[PDB]
Write a protein that binds this DNA or RNA. Structure first.
Lengths: 167, 115, 101
RNA sequence: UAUAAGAAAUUAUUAAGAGCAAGAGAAUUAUUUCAUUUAUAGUGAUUAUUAAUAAACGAGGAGAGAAAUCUUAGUAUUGUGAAUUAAAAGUAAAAAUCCGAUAAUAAUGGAAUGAUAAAAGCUAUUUAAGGUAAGAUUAAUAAAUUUAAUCCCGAGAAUAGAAACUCUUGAAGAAGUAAAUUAUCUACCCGUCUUGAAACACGGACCAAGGAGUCUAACAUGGAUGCGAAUGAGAAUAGCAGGAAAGCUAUAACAUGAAGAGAAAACGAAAAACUAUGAGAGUGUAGAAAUACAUUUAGCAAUAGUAUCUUUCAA
RNA sequence: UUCCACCUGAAUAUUCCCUUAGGAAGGUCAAAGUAUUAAUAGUAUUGAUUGGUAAAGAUAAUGAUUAGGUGUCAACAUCUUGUCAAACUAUGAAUAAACAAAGAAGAAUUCUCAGUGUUAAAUACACUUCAGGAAUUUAAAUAUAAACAUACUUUGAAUCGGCCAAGUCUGGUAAGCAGGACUGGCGAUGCGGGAUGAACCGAACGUCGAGAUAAAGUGCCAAA
RNA sequence: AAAAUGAAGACAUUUUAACGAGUAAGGAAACGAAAUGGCGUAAGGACAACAAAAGUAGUAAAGAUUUAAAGUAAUUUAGAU
């Protein structure tokens, strides 16, 4: 035979839309077409982020969008994830393109004079991406990450899943 | 020298390099071992290294030019036939009449029956 | 497929065709010369086989120049053969001493 | 609707006729390969032309063979000779054998898997990049892959040329497939424990049917789903139409979360943050097909390190 | 302890247990899910090192041991000789171990330059993204391989009765004995050869056709 | 694995390249370029002659015995009794 370091195994990268969502299937069909034809790194990025699992597409709040759009007045924030609403802080005027908008987030963005776009309108208006800012939410804020590891560790102890008689 | 029991090697002639590249030559293009069929495929792969035809590929290998490393690393390892390896067996050095070791210019006789 | 890969094949093929035709003529014309030289040698041998013709009488000394010239060369070329023969003799002496240690 | 393509049917002749499948061929070919023959810039040895000296060697000395004309025989003159040398021949490529070097181009026949089409086929006519020992003839000379001349051939390119075939077998059974038998090769008893069982290790006489990771409850990870500073409220329970173990509606106690640290008392978070690398968007140039450099801009996720703040004896 | 095909594919180390026919941490392995990625190496070379094995030595230190001269029968000195050490050593390989060969992010230079502190005082020096800021130059710094590369994160299966070989070692008279260092295998593995064989030699396997082969063979069984 | 194409064709697309041994063990379902592909048993909700009589069945169901065909295989299909 042949002395290979390792045998061929499936590459651990998603290439389609997870689940049976008919609309999310068409979005991947649209951006898989755009990235192949336009050969734009922006469409390759949006296509890749559309294929992540739900846990890997964390939310972005209106407060975080406002901070990132401060020095970008006429721009379009583009986050492939649900956009929630931070009720603690005001929402300025800005245009956001996202997969889904919370009822309160959509009201707040619209009431400020902004716009809530979907990814087909963004591809229709800015296919290769010209006045957009790519944004993704934080991943390590998940509480599940606290318990990972060994809680007896000297350096970075875990968080000891609560249970029988935990003090 | 360290891997002597597992290899036999020597110094090729120009005709040995010519026949190996022409018949068994191949290139790694986009991770695919594409056999050599035209100069355009050679120009595409090694155009940046001023090797635009199969004769630049043969000449560079034989004389070991400036871009030997890049040209040689593109050439996929040749797959050869079988042949009478030795006189006694391949468990002794060619100096003792065996199969492995440094055959010097005598490696061309072996390669003649092997290509 | 060879022409497509190496367009210089036609140029090199023609030279191979020329040399093959030319080398055949040289060997063919050298054979004709050697037939005459062998014919000359045969005549000298058959004529000197008559040393059998004849109580010994001073054995039989045979003439030194029974072999006849077949090709003709100028005197300058005649002197060059004696020069060439001296060199090939010196080279053999040069080589024999070297391997003789 | 305009033009080929121009079907089926029809007329006269015969070199007078299907489809499919198997087999044998023909012509030109693709990949691999078998057998035979053929040349491989050895300056290696021999391959009758005469003569001389030899370092060594044993002998001699004064009826056979042939149609020869010349030798053989047996009852101190001469023979052989490695090696060296003279003259002749020889420009130092023939052939044969041996020793070295190689195995390649080609041709002639096949085999396995195919293909059928015309060319970056091949061929012919024009000009001429070239022929680096070697395309040829010459000359000067020469242990030359050293120089000059004029002949020859000729790559590119432009212009013109050429491929549609034979025979045999098959509904009187082709090709294939299956069953039984024969023949050559091949084949130890399954499951399990075990380093190791065909085992002189255990279970198995045979067949049918049954036969062994399920259910409830708590937690965690993960993939799909709804909503999102909230989610659930099929918590009990209360109403609706319909007659209903189904469906729908209930501004609601509570559960988890939004705030964390301390045994507890007592408390309870901004310098509207900083640094590094990093996703993306342009403009120019060039190769030139894609693509490769120059330059402007933004700096999300993630990792690490900083200040600052809450709690603790202790971060 | 009950159906098929396909893909990947192990273990006998380490710590603890009233533990030794068993468990948990951990290693090996699978599946899910990521990151443009200061995030490549069971390799060689060059340069600076480390160590005390093989060897070597034996009035070179500690020991063991056979003799012969000379000086004042011993004895004691001194000069030679013969033979040794796992718990002796001056010297000391081969094989190895750990570095460097340009990542505060691919160099360098010039100008300017601040906060602390060391300091007798510093413009020196130390740390501060080689604090910071601006210009010019620049892709260079052994070989070889590496983009289905690399770095992983989470969850989890089985496993920790092993056995064999040897230009190896220890106990034993020795063992197809008992126990170890390094590597390759069998276990988990069929195929060709050694008549036969878990480990030997060649070589690892989708279904086939044609060829050149390997170990090894060519009187017949048996192809040559 | 990478390119190309992609509302429906179809054979789970087209091309190129590398690869395919294996005990214990793992790879749940769904995911158009599909994060392994499938066969079988029984029951429940649907669909099954698109033009107002809409799957098969006394012109012979299920079952049983065999003969052949499709599939690498689990198995399926059809004929005869």
């Amino acid at each position: 035979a042949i002395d290979l370091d390792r045998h061929h195994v499936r590459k651990h990268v998603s290439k389609t839309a997870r689940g049976n969502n008919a609309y999310m299937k068409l979005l991947v069909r649209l951006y898989g077409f755009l990235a192949r034809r336009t050969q734009s790194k922006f469409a390759k990025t949006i296509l890749h982020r559309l294929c992540l699992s739900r846990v890997n597409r964390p939310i972005v709040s209106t407060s975080k969008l406002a901070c990132l759009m401060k020095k970008h007045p006429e721009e379009t924030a583009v986050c492939v994830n649900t956009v929630t609403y931070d009720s603690r802080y005001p929402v300025p005027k800005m245009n956001v393109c996202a997969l889904k908008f919370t009822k309160t987030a959509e009201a707040a963005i619209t009431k400020a004079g902004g716009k809530c776009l979907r990814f087909d309108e963004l591809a229709l208006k800015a296919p290769t991406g010209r006045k957009t800012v790519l944004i993704r939410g934080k991943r390590n804020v998940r509480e599940a990450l606290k318990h990972f590891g060994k809680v007896c560790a000297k350096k970075n102890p875990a968080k000891q899943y609560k249970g029988k008689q935990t003090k | 020298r360290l891997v002597d029991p597992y290899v036999t090697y020597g110094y090729p002639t120009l005709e040995t390099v010519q026949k190996l590249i022409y018949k068994r030559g191949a290139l790694k293009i986009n991770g695919n071992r594409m056999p050599i069929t035209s100069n355009c495929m050679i120009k595409k792969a090694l155009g940046d290294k001023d090797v635009v035809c199969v004769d630049d590929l043969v000449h560079e290998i034989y004389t070991v030019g400036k871009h030997f490393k890049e040209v040689n690393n593109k050439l996929a390892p040749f797959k050869l036939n079988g042949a009478k390896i030795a006189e006694k067996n391949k468990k002794i050095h060619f100096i003792l009449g065996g199969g492995f070791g440094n055959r010097e210019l005598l490696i061309n006789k072996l390669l003649a029956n092997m290509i | 497929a060879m022409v497509k890969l190496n367009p210089y094949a036609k140029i090199a093929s023609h030279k191979l065709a020329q040399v093959a035709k030319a080398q055949a003529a040289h060997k063919a014309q050298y054979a004709a010369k050697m037939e005459k030289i062998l014919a000359a040698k045969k005549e000298a041998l058959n004529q000197s086989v008559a040393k059998r013709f004849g109580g010994k009488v001073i054995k039989v000394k045979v003439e030194n120049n029974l072999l006849k010239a077949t090709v003709k060369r100028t005197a300058k070329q005649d002197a060059y053969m004696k020069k060439y023969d001296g060199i090939v003799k010196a080279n053999a002496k040069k080589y024999a001493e070297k391997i003789g240690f």
